Amino acid sequence: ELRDQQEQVKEDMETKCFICGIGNDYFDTVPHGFETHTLQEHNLANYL
Amino acid sequence: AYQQKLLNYFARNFYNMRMLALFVAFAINFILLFYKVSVHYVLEESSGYMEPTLRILAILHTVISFFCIIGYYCLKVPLVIFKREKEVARKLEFDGLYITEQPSEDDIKGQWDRLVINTQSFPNNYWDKFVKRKVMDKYGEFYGRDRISELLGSAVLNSIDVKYQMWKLGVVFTDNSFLYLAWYMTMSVLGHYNNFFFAAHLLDIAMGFKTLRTILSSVTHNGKQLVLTVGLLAVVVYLYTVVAFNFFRKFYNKSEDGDTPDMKCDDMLTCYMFHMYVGVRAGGGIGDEIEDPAGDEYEIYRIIFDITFFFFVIVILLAIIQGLIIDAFGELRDQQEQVKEDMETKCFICGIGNDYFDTVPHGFETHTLQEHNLANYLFFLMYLINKDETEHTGQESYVWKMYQERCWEFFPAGDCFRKQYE
Amino acid sequence: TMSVLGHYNNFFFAAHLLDIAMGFKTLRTILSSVTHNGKQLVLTVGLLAVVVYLYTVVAFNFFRKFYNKSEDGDTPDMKCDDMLTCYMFHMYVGVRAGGGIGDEIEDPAGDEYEIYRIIFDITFFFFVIVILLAIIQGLIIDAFG
Amino acid sequence: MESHKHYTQSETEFLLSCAETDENETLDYEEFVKRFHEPAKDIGFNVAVLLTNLSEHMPNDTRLQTFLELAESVLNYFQPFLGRIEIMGSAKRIERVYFEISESSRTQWEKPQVKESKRQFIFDVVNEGGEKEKMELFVNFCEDTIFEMQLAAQI
Numbered sequence: 001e002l003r004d005q006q007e008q009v010k011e012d013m014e015t016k017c018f019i020c021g022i023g024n025d026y027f028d029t030v031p032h033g034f035e036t037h038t039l040q041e042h043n044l045a046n047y048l
Numbered sequence: 049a050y051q052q053k054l055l056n057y058f059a060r061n062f063y064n065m066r067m068l069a070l071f072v073a074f075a076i077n078f079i080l081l082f083y084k085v086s087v088h089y090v091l092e093e094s095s096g097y098m099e100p101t102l103r104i105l106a107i108l109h110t111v112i113s114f115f116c117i118i119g120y121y122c123l124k125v126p127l128v129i130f131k132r133e134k135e136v137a138r139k140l141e142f143d144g145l146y147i148t149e150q151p152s153e154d155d156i157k158g159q160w161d162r163l164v165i166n167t168q169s170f171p172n173n174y175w176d177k178f179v180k181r182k183v184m185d186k187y188g189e190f191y192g193r194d195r196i197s198e199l200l201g202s203a204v205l206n207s208i209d210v211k212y213q214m215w216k217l218g219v220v221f222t223d224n225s226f227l228y229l230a231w232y233m234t235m236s237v238l239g240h241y242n243n244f245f246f247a248a249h250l251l252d253i254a255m256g257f258k259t260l261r262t263i264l265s266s267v268t269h270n271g272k273q274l275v276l277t278v279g280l281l282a283v284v285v286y287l288y289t290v291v292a293f294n295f296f297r298k299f300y301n302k303s304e305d306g307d308t309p310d311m312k313c314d315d316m317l318t319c320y321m322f323h324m325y326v327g328v329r330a331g332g333g334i335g336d337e338i339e340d341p342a343g344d345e346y347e348i349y350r351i352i353f354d355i356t357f358f359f360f361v362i363v364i365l366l367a368i369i370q371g372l373i374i375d376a377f378g379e380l381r382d383q384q385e386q387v388k389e390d391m392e393t394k395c396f397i398c399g400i401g402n403d404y405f406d407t408v409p410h411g412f413e414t415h416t417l418q419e420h421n422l423a424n425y426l427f428f429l430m431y432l433i434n435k436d437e438t439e440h441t442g443q444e445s446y447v448w449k450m451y452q453e454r455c456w457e458f459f460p461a462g463d464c465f466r467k468q469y470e
Numbered sequence: 471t472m473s474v475l476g477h478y479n480n481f482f483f484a485a486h487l488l489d490i491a492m493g494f495k496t497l498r499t500i501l502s503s504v505t506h507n508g509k510q511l512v513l514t515v516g517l518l519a520v521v522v523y524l525y526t527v528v529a530f531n532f533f534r535k536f537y538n539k540s541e542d543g544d545t546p547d548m549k550c551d552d553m554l555t556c557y558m559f560h561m562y563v564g565v566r567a568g569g570g571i572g573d574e575i576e577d578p579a580g581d582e583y584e585i586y587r588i589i590f591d592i593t594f595f596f597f598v599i600v601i602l603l604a605i606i607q608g609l610i611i612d613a614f615g
Numbered sequence: 616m617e618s619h620k621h622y623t624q625s626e627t628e629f630l631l632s633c634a635e636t637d638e639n640e641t642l643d644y645e646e647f648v649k650r651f652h653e654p655a656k657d658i659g660f661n662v663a664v665l666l667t668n669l670s671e672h673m674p675n676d677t678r679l680q681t682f683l684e685l686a687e688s689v690l691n692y693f694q695p696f697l698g699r700i701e702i703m704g705s706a707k708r709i710e711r712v713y714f715e716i717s718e719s720s721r722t723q724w725e726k727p728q729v730k731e732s733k734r735q736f737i738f739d740v741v742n743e744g745g746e747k748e749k750m751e752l753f754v755n756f757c758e759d760t761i762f763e764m765q766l767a768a769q770i
């Protein structure tokens with residue numbers, strides 16, 4: 001159960017965004033785009 | 049020239065010869081199993097010369113182990129040196145750490161490579177011979193022309209590079225698999241020195257099979273917590289020793305009935321080694337191998353000490369070891385199934401999905417077998433390396449400029465050919 | 471033919487108890503937690519044989535004065551200082567003792583090799599009884615999963 | 616050539632009258648192949664890259680499909696040799712690229728070994744690979760596999 005928790009976190013950080021909570025097929029009509037979306041558009045540290 | 053034809057028999061035939069070394073080690077250790085003390089001596093329920101069969105087979109085994117370190121040096125050493133020269137060239141051309149950043153006293157795996165840039169045969173096994181002038185053109189304008197051009201750079205015996213070749217031997221001797229094969233040959237030689245050494249070549253079922261590796265990989269990837277659990281067992285058994293020394297040391301009589309010259313555990317080290325040698329391996333705790341409480345003053349404190357010994361060592365900690373093994377099996381199988389999911393739900397390169405390529409009847413199989421089909425990118429890269437730079441077409445020279453530039457736009461991001469048109 | 475040989479001898483007839491395996495449903499869903507995971511189970515037993523062999527190779531060559539099966543040595547003492555008998559001693563006693571081989575052995579009582587003997591015994595206990603039998607049991611449980 | 620069922624009989628006379636009639640009734644195998652096959656194969660491959668590129672780029676046309684089923688025995692022979700990838704060719708649409716897969720490169724890729732290195736690589740990428748560094752992992756695998764092939768087809 002401990003390992004299942006530690007893998008559920010990785011799934012919800014590589015399938016949805018954190019803040020806008022969209023999904024992943026939307027930000028990948030751009031070539032290589034969800035990485036830019038969670039590193040420049042929102043990127044949790046910048047709200048901090 | 050006959051040396052090279054003899055020498056493409058070692059490298060052609062490395063795997064079968066390595067498996068043959070393992071079978072010969074099986075047969076020699078099987079013959080070794082018929083020893084006897086009398087000095088050591090072998091009997092014979094066999095054919096007439098079964099001590100000279102071992103005298104044959106040990107010589108044949110050392111011949112074959114040397115024969116396969118030759119085969120390894122001529123088969124899988126060019127790939128090690130290709131990966132090392134590849135990384136050194138792609139760290140000069142795009143990071144320039146020997147030109148700009150100067151790697152630290154940490155990472156001797158990189159700081160050793162300072163002795164091959166200065167050499168004069170640096171791109172031997174890398175098919176990219178222009179690394180020298182490419183670094184000179186990238187950095188030789190700001191960081192000085194002559195400095196970079198000076199930093200880069202029996203008669204046949206004095207025509208080879210000595211520094212490059214010493215660098216090559218330095219990289220080879222620091223490799224893992226070659227060091228293992230050298231160990232294997234030296235244990236063959238010490239098996240001629242002493243026939244009992246030859247049994248340590250039974251170690252090669254670990255580093256030589258497939259399903260034996262998929263069983264030992266249920267330990268060896270979960271190993272840090274296994275080591276830490278054994279160490280935690282040592283500390284818990286120590287703290288029980290600290291209790292047992294300081295309130296309980298009149299229950300430890302290994303001797304018969306006390307009339308005998310009685311031994312106790314009222315030193316500290318001997319009580320602790322008593323616990324880790326007897327109390328852990330008894331199965332029933334330590335209240336097995338001890339004098340028992342028979343109506344003493346400390347009977348209840350003794351019972352509580354024993355039962356918490358039994359839980360907190362034998363039930364819980366050995367269950368942590370066994371559950372850690374079983375979870376290692378589970379995590380390994382979960383990886384091997386995640387790979388199958390990401391090869392049957394997305395494409396590899398265009399990374400689309402599966403509901404899009406199945407509006408065509410039976411279409412994702414054609415999409416990952418004809419449209420992209422990972423081998424064809426491999427064959428296309430082999431094509432671009434192989435042609436001359438003048439002979440490229442428009443698309444091949446564009447893609448070739450991208451590949452020498454190392455930027456990787458041109459693989460499809462999310463945009464397969466069917467999606468482009470309509 | 472085992473029915474006919476059961477007429478030849480009535481004790482043969484017990485081998486028709488083998489048909490609960492190839493004749494039920496939930497008995498097959500329990501034996502299918504072994505019989506599809508069987509190659510690694512066989513290989514784990516074989517690896518146990520090789521590990522116990524290498525322990526025999528140590529125990530023959532430095533330790534063979536601790537093996538007295540006989541009472542007190544005044545008796546006409548048996549040892550394990552052949553190779554096959556020491557190895558069959560290990561795979562018949564040292565694996566099935568539960569507490570390693572430091573159970574069924576003479577113990578170190580302040581000898582020269584006491585510490586080397588203790589290390590030999592405890593690594594016997596881990597690398598056979600904890601780890602390999604846990605590999606068998608974890609392989610069964612993962613077959614269920 | 617009559618026993619091997621391949622050739623219509625006027626074309627058997629054509630291949631007879633073609634070759635050499637080398638001084639008794641003889642003809643070379645190799646020096647009739649090399650002079651009626653190297654060039655032939657080359658042109659065939661180039662023409663296949665043309666007809667295929669027309670069919671793949673211009674589908675749903677009766678006339679080209681009629682011409683292609685008119686011309687099938689070259690496209691069948693050159694299917695194990697032509698590979699086609701898709702890239703982004705600087706006009707910011709997506710073009711496809713045709714090229715010439717060799718033979719030793721074709722029978723080298725799967726031998727027992729590289730066929731297993733490929734699934735080792737795929738197991739590495741899905742386990743620990745990312746969004747950004749993925750294709751740069753794939754080209755490091757490509758360059759290593761190509762050097763392994765350049766060895767193992769010269770042994």
Ligand SMILES: [Zn+2]
Pocket residue numbers: 017018019020021042
């Ligand atoms: Zn957001």
Ligand SMILES: [Zn+2]
Pocket residue numbers: 395396397398399420460464
């Ligand atoms: Zn794709």
